[model samples]
Target: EVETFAFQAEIAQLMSLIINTFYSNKEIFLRELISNSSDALDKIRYESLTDPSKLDSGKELHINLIPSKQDRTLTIVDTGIGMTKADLINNLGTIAKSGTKAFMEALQAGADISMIGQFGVGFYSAYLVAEKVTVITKHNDDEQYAWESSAGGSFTVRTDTGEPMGRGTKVILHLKEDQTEYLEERRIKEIVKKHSQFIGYPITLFVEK
Candidate 1:
């Protein structure tokens, strides 16, 4: 059954702040998303230490960025530990306990603020350039599912019957009218190298001829 939930009050406010006040540079969205992918890859690799099969028999850990000029979509795919249904609600639907407050306070205090994602609202930054966002993920312990939202007050999650991801997550961002710059190969390469060159996993950008 598909499930829908409204963002927590604090989370809703945080999203507004992210889209309105913070993240002045729209390109920062790619940095935050790639950071998240690196974290997920780190987690799955760590888990493999306890159980050899945790990595699905040593699945490669990497990130792929596919940009569609025709559709104006940017897709980020990672072979890492995907989220389950509950994880989607808990992570995306609500700001971690006290995180929203800390984030706001930091902004007001004029902190160095290099890593804006430390507050857990980095995912919301996608709204800065995407009209809508879709996440298709499959975890080892759970079935594949899709989560989508438009930076509205709520989001929806439903079972994904499409081709199985095997193990990982894919995030598709529907670009906004003014954000087509993100769809260009040169622009994406510059952003990736600038922000994600040091990431633990290999980041590949797919260019469609």
Candidate 2:
């Protein structure tokens, strides 16, 4: 198991850059988060071949996209090996796992900015346009937990009172005004195809008509 850590001082600066400008094509944030979920699903599927019962029964390795007009919300849900509480904090709330320092060192030594997100900042891209980001997730080894952050310095994590959503993660974004572009299915499909078509898992887009 990997030990968790907070963002290094330099890495906090890197996260600020991302929150400020790195993801300019904001609609693509959905594509990136979906792509990351698919990767998570793929990882557990491979792990389960050897550990047959490792995943939740009836949980399929797939993705779901649902938009709610009443709430001005868009959600991306996945039925993968879900994430632990620590995983939520480290993966969603901090820039530590992103290897920000190493990536910066590479750049200072002349690597490409194009590859930074590839180091694992894909999930945080949701902050690009989210007024409130809610991650409702259940891990195989832990109880369901909801991590909420408005991208301000403060965030909250509490036990989710809702039923465990089987073996997966759900990210619901209360979209900001300019983020409405992500609510359109056609636009979302284009974004997915552009950045995630080559991902190893089957990617499904579900929209209400």
Candidate 3:
């Protein structure tokens, strides 16, 4: 069964603030997402140390950026520990800390970006450049599922009938009209080099000849 939920009240308010205030530097979205992927990969690597079969023994840890000029879409795929349904709800629907209300209170009081990691809201940064965002993920204990939203204070999750991902997550950003520069190969490489070059995982960008 599919499930839908409205963002917690404070989360909705914070989204409005993020959309309005972060216009000048939308490129930070890529850096934040790549950092998140690296973290997920590191998590699985650590878990594998305790249980050698947690992830497939031979699966490589890497991130792939696939840009589609035709669709004006940018997808970031990672072979890492994917989210379960409960994780999707807890991670995406609500702030991971005490509550969204506290985060919003802090933000409105002039909190800096340095505190963003505490709230686990970095994924919402995608809204700075995308009209819509889709996440397809598969975990070892759960079937494939997709979560999608337009950052409109609500999101939905449904089982995915497409090909299985084995173990990982894919975030697809549907570019906004004025944000098409994110689809350019050169621009993406520059952003990655500037912000994520030192990340622990290999970041590969796919481009057409």
TM-score of each: 0.92, 0.81, 0.90
Which residue pairs overlap in candidate 2's backbone? Answer: none
**lDDT: the better of candidates 1 and 2:** 1
Q: How far is 190's C-alpha from truth in model 2 (Å)? A: 1.4
**Candidate 2 off by > 4 Å:** 1-12, 90-98, 103-114
Q: How many backbone clashes does candidate 3 have?
A: 0
| Regions more than 4 Å wrong, model 1 | 22-24, 91-95, 111-114
The model with the greatest lDDT is: 1
Give the per-residue lDDT digits (tens) of candidate 1, residues 1-209: 78988878877776776656645578989998998888889989988889878777338999999999888899999998889888888855444647667877897798633446888757767888898999999888898999998868888999999988888889999998989999999999999889888997889999976
* Residue lDDT tens for model 2, 85-196: 8776655435454476676677679765556566666565677778888888887778888877665555667888887587788999998887787778887788777877
Candidate 1 colliding pairs: none
- Residue range 82-157, candidate 3, lDDT tens digits: 8898878876554444545666667779976545555676777787888899999988878889998887888889
Identify the runs in model 3 with alpha carbons over 4 angstroms from their true place.
Answer: 94-106, 109-115
**Prediction 1 TM-score vs. true:** 0.92
Q: Which wins on TM-score, candidate 1 or candidate 3?
A: 1
TM-score ranking from best candidate downward: 1, 3, 2
**lDDT over C-alpha atoms for residue 18 of model 2:** 57
